[PDB]
Amino acid sequence: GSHMGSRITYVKGDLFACPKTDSLAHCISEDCRMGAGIAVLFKKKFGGVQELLNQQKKSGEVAVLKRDGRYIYYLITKKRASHKPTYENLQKSLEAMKSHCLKNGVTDLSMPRIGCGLDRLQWENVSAMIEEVFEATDIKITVYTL
């Protein structure tokens, strides 16, 4: 291989205390309601709700805001807010995020345990998926944990 991979490391604490220059990621629905969970913090901090809606992204895609020189990734993992995501759509969204990272100079990415709270996925599976998606990159990933 030609890459060092994600080299996931874990930090106990609030995601929003991570470096302001890191790009961030979390999961939402096509509705872009962001009414519960960590999504409400992304909504309140970064805004841009209509700018997200205007991107008209679908399940398995990623919507993106540029905020202070870095990117905020909204992984569109399901159609409606009340639905649960499939692992297949999560993987697609992650791949789309990776593609954007590589097209836009992202080297340092932070995220919570995506999919594994309100969306009821298991971190055993999600963690392995993130690792595989980012294996052939040199994007360093940090996961913030509670």
Considering the complex, what minimum distance in angstroms separates the CB of residue 34 from Cl ion?
A: 5
Count of alpha carbons within 13 Å of 1, Cβ hemisphere only?
A: 9
Which uninterrupted H or E stretch holds 63?
strand 61-67
29 scored as a contact of Cl ion (CB under 5 A): yes
Find the Cα–Cα–Cα–Cα dihedral 31, 37, 41, 42, rounded to 10°.
Answer: -40
SS3 state at 71? strand
User: Per rule CB under 5 A, is residue 33 in the interface with Cl ion?
Assistant: yes
Distances in whole angstroms, Cα of residue 18 to Cα of each of 45, 60, 75, 102, 111: 14, 26, 19, 21, 9
Write the single-letter amino acid at 86: T
Does position 27 interact with Cl ion (CB under 5 A)? The reply is no
Annotated binding site for substrate: which residue ranges? 15, 113-119, 146
CB of residue 127 vs Cl ion: minimum separation in angstroms? 23
- Please enumerate, by residue number, every residue annotated as part of a binding site: 15, 113-119, 146
- Minimal distance, residue 33 CB to Cl ion, in Å: 4
Specify whether 58 is catalytic.
no
Binding piece for Cl ion, criterion CB under 5 A, among 26-34, 43-51, 54-62, 111-119: 26-34
* Marked catalytic residue, from 78, 92, 98, 140: 78
CA distances from 85 to 30, 81, 116 (A): 11, 10, 11
Q: Does 28 sit near Cl ion (CB under 5 A)?
A: yes
78 is catalytic: yes
Interface with Cl ion (CB under 5 A): 28-29, 31, 33-34, 81
Residues belonging to the active site = 78, 119
